[PDB]
């Protein structure tokens, strides 16, 4: 009775909990406490579901189910409410605060009035009663906040204008979007709200100190804690107005900022010129200021210490104080690193290895001034370095510190930078420094280039921070236009800000050329702004920027970082290239940088250990197997130095402890000197390197590590309680967990370096072949560390290239300027927001898909140390500390360099994953889950104790597979594909046993008949899995290597196949053959559609595909087109009555955007509390969407078919994102089918080895000559019924139908001309039109018969062919083969060479004479030209010929028309003849230079309701110079091949065509009501009345090109080769 | 006018730019111009239906690029700019680029340095022509390393001569000089030792 | 064809011209700590891996040229 108290529990709390109102400026009571609401809601949901687990349950069940129904509204209601509210407060200060909106806008300023009387009245009613069930009983409370959403939304959409005028005043605005700048505007009254925005707008400044009040601004702070207090506290009351605080608060910044350098400055002037330093002193003064300023005045020291010994020196005999210049140097360095020996906080800890870097910098410049006998201070050797002069007479406090390399003079920004990782200052950063400050001097921008991994991008920020600028990092990509780089410019002039735009080259060439402009005119008001002639009393220096006059300042400058060196990137204009100066970083100097890292963190060996790592990564990087996802450069030495000063920090503190808690003896120096820096280093080394290693290479590097690193071993440590987590998480997920050598060890310790990288790296790869388990690594380690540190963790799994990058990042509108978030985007500003609490979560991003430059590039910034995401509209999002970037790849033979090197690297093996785990998996799962959702289970784990022994190691299933994946099959194989094949074969016989038990109620299946049934089951399913996909002989060499190395009891048959077997349910063997009976076709059925005549194979595939199927497994059918894989899938089909089959047709051009307009026609989405499900409108029917061509779609040039990665994703995944909302959806009751032909194939892709992970193939070959004599004699037998004199001429008939068949499918194929493809649709239409000629006669000779033979073998085989000898070689092959299989018959009667049949002079389809012909089609052409068309036609034999085939092909049912041939040949004027005279209406769309693809929808629009509504015969004539663009060809390829346009008909054209057709239906005499039988009714219409005549030139590339653009055109259009005139 | 071709904004720019200068006679620049080929031929069939001024001029900078349609080829006048051919022929160009009052001011010195630099950068440039042997790479040694290290040598050396008539050629900054033109000028293009 | 003709002679010269057989170096436990030993493992398995390529690439040529085997797409681009 616990789930009785429990729900009683429940009951009382809501009952008693009350929404926690507090009062907002005496204008309403707002919601507060949205987080303990919440948790609220989804314990109770979750203890609801556990007692839905129990049985108990169900004397409770309805009680308990109402519960949930109003837990999920309450969630739904506070799921918009808190928008809402969020949304109206700022919004209230908006409307409120600011006077001038309400005459600039004054419309919506009324709306948002009437809102807010709304909104207060709601919460006033709330107030009255704050009972949260008595809120959630308020009449219409969801439509109402849905309603103050909506309208909430519309108001703030609309304020674009008044955001960028608020820019325009306080100009930092222009780096915070207009979510955040409305959240800014409107909380200015509280400014609480406000401290999670500093950081887009500041460089160092992450939040404000204020007062108890909040009305006065005390000071600033960083996001490391430090804090800056300013000299003249800024006033809020004083000024109340946001921007204008905000600028007194960043003057008050810099001021305050100048004012302690020169104080730092007068304090260290004692350390300067001092023989011994206090290391307390020094400490003191360290901790006393900032980090920067405490570097400042170290550098302003240094350099007028050295500007007073060269002075002095100046007379050149005199003494050399530059020697106390360097001792000074020197002791000061030797406190410096006492000082990091032992334990200090992490703030005076990074200030300390600041100074420690530029002390050493200084320390290597005195000894080389001293070195090169420097005497003078105007030598150059001493004038092109950094040299930092301070004034302290300045009245001016901003103009007291300059610093000068060489001629270039600069002034410190003094902007607040917080504690930035200094860069050690290597020669090379040196040359960028003297280059870059010499680029500034000519106002000219800088452009360093070179690989990647360099230092161009941190060189610029290291630059830009020595000189106290704000440095903005922008990641360009081809979307960064003109406009928005010319924003950007505008918001770095006004601001006075550094922009440093990496992969400039990234932009589009054209786009490169237009920011010229912007560019040099901004110099051009940087150079006027440098003459001294301009005073800044008069007007200030403006630009003309986007049609503005943008006022520029002198601190504002543009660097470039590109790497030229990768190929498609764009080249600069010359122009454009002059505005920089340009700088090559292609060597960092990784020896120093080493070097100074390792002494700066306390290593008391750094110069060997530099030494012994750099030398020790070049050998790693030449001495290890050449992979793609290997990368030993720069940013992987600074990742390992990083962790090697955390792990000695880890290990200090570890010492400590053990000492503390051994005794009471604890000593820093003891520690430092007996302290293993040598393992320290290579444990850093091993657990950054060992993971991205293959197999062979980790025995080379730990050789490599024996040999550089003598007597040092790596022991990894043992993480019990994580491994226990992830025993526990694989325990309940069916997985295999191993421990060192067991089963499952290789893949628990991919686990462990998976979580080891995750804590080094924000930015990780799985790298990989399918099925090498990186998924199931990074979900159990995601639920262990959940279940470990108690973080709930939240994965996000993108796939990049199943939608398009804009769709991905974010679109910018050209026309209004607006921003609209992509995936990628709207998920991280989702977590970055933290509306609903995401940063109190683990939130791992997992790009699960193919990486190409493309996409990837723009996340550098995000994978590197910026961790922002740039956008083109200039904000920048930054990456939370508990955000994971994670792609799970299967290979990276398309990312570059600067991929791989931002990223954390784990290689997964196909060896990882042995098949044991599979086949524990499998097992496991069909012992646990049972099948139904127990008899069912039982019978499941009887099934899976049967199939033990088999699914061993070096078992059955094992040593089958390996012979298999010997063998040759039709896609590639892979090992996954034909285990999940086996597996769902195997449920399919659980099922079996199932389904005889329940027809069997009284006597059950025993245990010796299970175990017959299910041995014998398993041997035919490893043959129709592991060999499926393959020929005839490879499924013979399967079988006989089973029989070889098999037990179980097998067909004792001498040579027929094990194939050709079936397993009954009474657990026999059964030859295939008894279920093929000689069938009896009906004369009024002969070769139709829907008609299949049962053969071995036609039974074995219909088998197959029903176990396949019925488990509702996506499948693929791969053979020769006409092969019979749609006629079998649809017969499969049959035997499942509640599967309903939607035909696709893919084309070259085909995206997922076909597949969501079948969506939208056949589907609808449903809120549900667990998300957006995508689901059939018809309840309990399954909808099975069978994709034809799955192979054409056109690969990128990064070898990805984009829908088949969404066909992936919605396979693997279960659903797919609308990009609307960036909303998952999940699929319910879809299934996927698909057909292909061989990928060998011409313009047939190999498709992605993740999507055939999912799909079993089944390989439909060509009916064999026994198997085409048995169905076209079946065929035959029936249609010559008809006429009892000739049924004995059914056998031979068929013959000679068969022979000659076969002729023409080995004389002509597409290696000659690409439509060349016969297939038995060649002999169904044959059987067809013999069909058809014979049905109206009465009797008919032998020769008659033999005549119509021939005439449809003319037609059929002759029609298409392009040169004269191949339609020579057809007629003399006819006639050889009608004499060789009808001997004894009238050859000249049945054989007169002009063989025409028409039935124009008679009812009837009879033979026609040419001269009696040739007469009536002059009749019909003279009343032709009097009626329609009077343009003389000149007749001949040809003609005759033509419009005879025209003719039929429009007699016929979904009758089109490929004709092709010579321009000005009549092919248009013939078919409108021919129209004319079979009463078709002629349809021509008339194309201007302005037609779009708007307008042809249009015009096919008015086509299908003329031929489907009206029930009017319309033939539509198009030209290939008609088809102006690839959609085109899409819509006629999807209405030749189905009849119908999935997308055509929306919105109120949808509902006009339904009232049009339910008018047609009724005058039809059909009751017709519902849409979608309205809609089948339609689409047969126009299947009926509809003949599309497609005209184009005999082009040889063209035709190729077509074959594969627009397939229907080659498979459902009747192709007529007219030529040229002969 | 100058122009920069590009974007749909410039191309508006250019055609209002165009039909004022027909009126006017101005002189109207558009750059980059074969990165539009259909607003190039755009371009020519309205120039060749137009009676401009008597002294308007339109020059298109181009690179030379198949892509440029041959109707505006044969519509205008081509003029082909390259390196020169010899090193007497970039030292004139040299020359006549670089103003005179430039060269003529008060150090005397001043116009053999300029000398020393215009047959440094001939040499170079020629040496260009030589792939493999004169240098490593086709570097882009141009323009404007010439215009950087005549601005480097006019700052250095009115740094060192205060508006003397005279400066020994031991004063003159020659370590400046050097090391600007091969860390800054001249060596920021080379990426090899 | 005699552009069939000419590449069929063309990839049996070919055929001849190049060797047949590349061994994989063997790995020791002494074998490893020798750099000579690590660099020539890793050049010889290259070769054998590009030889075995190359060889099956003109095998499949030649094939072709006389009719045996169809052309696939990726013979038919190695043919162009
Ligand atoms: N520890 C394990 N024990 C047993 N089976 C496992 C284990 N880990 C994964 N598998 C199974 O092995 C197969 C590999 O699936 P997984 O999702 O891990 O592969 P993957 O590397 O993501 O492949 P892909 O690159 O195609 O996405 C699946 O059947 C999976 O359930
Ligand atoms: N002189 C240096 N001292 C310390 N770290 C450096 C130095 N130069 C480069 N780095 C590091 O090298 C890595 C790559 O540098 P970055 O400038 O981001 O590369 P890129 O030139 O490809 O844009 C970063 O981790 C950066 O901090
Ligand atoms: N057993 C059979 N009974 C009837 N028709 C068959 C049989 N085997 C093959 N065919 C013929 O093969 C052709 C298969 O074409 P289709 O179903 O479109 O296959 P695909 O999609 O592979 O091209 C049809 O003309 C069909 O009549
Ligand atoms: N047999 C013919 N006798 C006379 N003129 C013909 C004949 N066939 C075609 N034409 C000419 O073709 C012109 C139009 O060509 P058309 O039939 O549209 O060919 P296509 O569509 O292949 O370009 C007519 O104006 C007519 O003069």
Known sequence: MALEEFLKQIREVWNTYELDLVNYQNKCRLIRGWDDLFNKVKEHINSVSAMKLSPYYKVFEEDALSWEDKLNRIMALFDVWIDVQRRWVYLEGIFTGSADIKHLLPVETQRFQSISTEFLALMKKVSKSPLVMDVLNIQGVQRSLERLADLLGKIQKALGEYLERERSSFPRFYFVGDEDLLEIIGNSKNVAKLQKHFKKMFAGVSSIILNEDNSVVLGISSREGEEVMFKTPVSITEHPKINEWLTLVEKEMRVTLAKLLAESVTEVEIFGKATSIDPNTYITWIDKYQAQLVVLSAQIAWSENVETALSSMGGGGDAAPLHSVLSNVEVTLNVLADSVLMEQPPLRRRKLEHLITELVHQRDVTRSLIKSKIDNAKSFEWLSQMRFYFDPKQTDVLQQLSIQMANAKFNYGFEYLGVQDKLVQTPLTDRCYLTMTQALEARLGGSPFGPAGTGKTESVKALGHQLGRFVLVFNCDETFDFQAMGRIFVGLCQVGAWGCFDEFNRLEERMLSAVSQQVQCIQEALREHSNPNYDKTSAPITCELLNKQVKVSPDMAIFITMNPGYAGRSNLPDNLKKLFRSLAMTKPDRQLIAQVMLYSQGFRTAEVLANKIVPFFKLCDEQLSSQSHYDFGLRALKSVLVSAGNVKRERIQKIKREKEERGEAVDEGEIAENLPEQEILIQSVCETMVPKLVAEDIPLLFSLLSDVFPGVQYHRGEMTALREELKKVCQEMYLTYGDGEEVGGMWVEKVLQLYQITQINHGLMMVGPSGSGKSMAWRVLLKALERLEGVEGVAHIIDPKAISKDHLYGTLDPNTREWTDGLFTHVLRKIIDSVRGELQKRQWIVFDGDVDPEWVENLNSVLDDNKLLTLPNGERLSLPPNVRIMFEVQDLKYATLATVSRCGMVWFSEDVLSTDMIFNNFLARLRSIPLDESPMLQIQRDAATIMQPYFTSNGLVTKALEHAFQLEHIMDLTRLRCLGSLFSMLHQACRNVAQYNANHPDFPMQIEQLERYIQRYLVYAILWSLSGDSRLKMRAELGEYIRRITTVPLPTAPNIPIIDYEVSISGEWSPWQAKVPQIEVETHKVAAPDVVVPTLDTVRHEALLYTWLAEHKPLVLCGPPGSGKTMTLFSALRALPDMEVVGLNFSSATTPELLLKTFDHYCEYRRTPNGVVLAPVQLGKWLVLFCDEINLPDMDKYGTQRVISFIRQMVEHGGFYRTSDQTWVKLERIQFVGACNPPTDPGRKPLSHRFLRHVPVVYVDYPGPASLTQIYGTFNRAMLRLIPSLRTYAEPLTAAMVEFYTMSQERFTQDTQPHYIYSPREMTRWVRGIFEALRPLETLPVEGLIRIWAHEALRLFQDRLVEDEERRWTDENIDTVALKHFPNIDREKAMSRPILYSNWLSKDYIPVDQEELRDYVKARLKVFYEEELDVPLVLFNEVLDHVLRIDRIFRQPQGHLLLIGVSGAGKTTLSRFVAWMNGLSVYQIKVHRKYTGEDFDEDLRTVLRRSGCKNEKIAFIMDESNVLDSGFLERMNTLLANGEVPGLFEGDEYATLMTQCKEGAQKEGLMLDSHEELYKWFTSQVIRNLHVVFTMNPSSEGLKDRAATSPALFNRCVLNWFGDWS | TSIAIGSAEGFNQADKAINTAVKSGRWVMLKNVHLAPGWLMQLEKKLHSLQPHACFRLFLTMEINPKVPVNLLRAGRIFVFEPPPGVKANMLRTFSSIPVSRICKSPNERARLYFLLAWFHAIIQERLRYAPLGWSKKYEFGESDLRSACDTVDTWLDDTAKGRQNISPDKIPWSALKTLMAQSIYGGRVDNE | ?80
């Open chain 3, 1 to 80: 064809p005699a552009w069939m003709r000419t590449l069929h002679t063309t990839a049996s010269n070919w055929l001849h011209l190049i060797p047949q057989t590349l061994s994989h170096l063997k790995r020791t436990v002494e074998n490893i700590k020798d750099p000579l030993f690590r660099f020539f493992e890793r050049e010889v398995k290259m070769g054998a891996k590009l030889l075995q390529d190359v060889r099956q690439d003109l095998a499949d040529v030649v094939q072709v040229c006389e009719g045996k085997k169809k052309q696939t797409n990726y013979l038919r681009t190695l043919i162009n």
